[PDB]
């Protein structure tokens, strides 16, 4: 009854509610729709992110996975690598262009075999490494440069992380999540 | 100083590897290299969140013997 999709969706979700990764927690938005899920998403320690409780929604077609989902954080978050409307830019969300001129890879496209462990793990090196030749948020891109360029004495990139995470607050304390804050809290 | 560490691969596999407490992030690519071909500018080993920088060591990130690390390939294309 439970139709191809909802039968990897099912798999996929076991998987990542028995063995997640570690700082992120999966749960069906609806209990009874497996195509939408909640990506509760901690900043890590030893990070300008360590306290951040950060919300994403991933949600999946009808054809999964031989589709690519999306990925979108709720409450937006200022990156030079993250879309203003909360989209993330990862090559492998969205389908191969079957151009042998483009020089691209099957592992950075699409593919039935790529699954939501990748997506979260490519979204970890995506937060850790801007990208400013191809930025998805211009603006904080040449914020994020200045920020670098200046060793840290123009601090306004620093000061919105400052925000950003303080914003969450009050979203950890009504879930009553307790963020880590040290590194064997966080591999817990 | 000795231990024993674990990379996770996005293919499912486990590359188990010998290493000091005092290699860099460059010596443990080199060795993913030698095992597994990837040339070391398109690794990107994850601990705890954290993109491990080629010229630290294992020991500036506390990763400690039996810790799991997460191989990804840097991203492309912006
Ligand atoms: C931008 O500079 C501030 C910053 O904290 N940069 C970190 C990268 C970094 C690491 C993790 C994330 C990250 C990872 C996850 Cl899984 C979730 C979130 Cl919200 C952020 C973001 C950046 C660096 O590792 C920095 O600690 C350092 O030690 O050099």
Redesign the pocket.
């Known amino acids: 009854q439970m139709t191809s999709s909802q039968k990897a969706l099912m798999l996929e979700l076991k998987s990542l509610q028995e063995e997640p990764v570690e700082?992120?927690r999966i749960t069906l938005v609806d209990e009874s729709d497996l195509y939408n899920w909640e990506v509760a998403?901690?900043?890590?320690p030893?990070?300008?992110?360590e306290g951040?409780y950060?919300k994403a929604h991933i949600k999946f077609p009808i054809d999964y996975p031989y589709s690519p989902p999306t990925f979108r954080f709720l409450t937006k978050?200022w990156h030079p690598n993250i879309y203003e409307n909360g989209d993330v830019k990862i090559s492998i969300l969205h389908p191969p262009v079957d151009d042998p001129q483009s020089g691209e890879l099957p592992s950075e496209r699409w593919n039935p075999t790529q699954n939501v462990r990748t997506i979260l793990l490519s979204?970890?090196s995506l937060?850790?490494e801007p990208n400013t030749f191809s930025p998805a948020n211009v603006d904080a891109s040449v914020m994020?440069r200045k920020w670098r360029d200046s060793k840290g004495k123009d601090k306004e990139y620093?000061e919105i992380?400052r925000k950003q995470v303080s914003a969450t607050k009050a979203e950890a304390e009504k879930d009553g999540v307790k963020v880590p804050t040290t590194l064997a809290e966080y591999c817990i | 100083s000795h231990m024993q560490i674990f990379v996770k691969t996005l293919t499912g596999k486990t590359i188990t590897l010998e290493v000091e407490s005092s290699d860099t992030i460059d010596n443990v690519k080199s060795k993913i290299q030698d095992k597994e071909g990837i040339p070391p500018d398109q690794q990107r080993l994850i601990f705890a969140?954290?993109?491990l920088?080629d010229g630290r060591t294992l020991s500036d990130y506390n990763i400690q013997k039996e810790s799991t690390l997460h191989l990804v390939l840097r991203l492309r294309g912006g």
């Open positions: 700082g992120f998403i901690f900043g890590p030893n990070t300008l992110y951040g950060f978050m979204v970890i937060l850790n994020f620093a992380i | 969140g954290k993109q920088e």
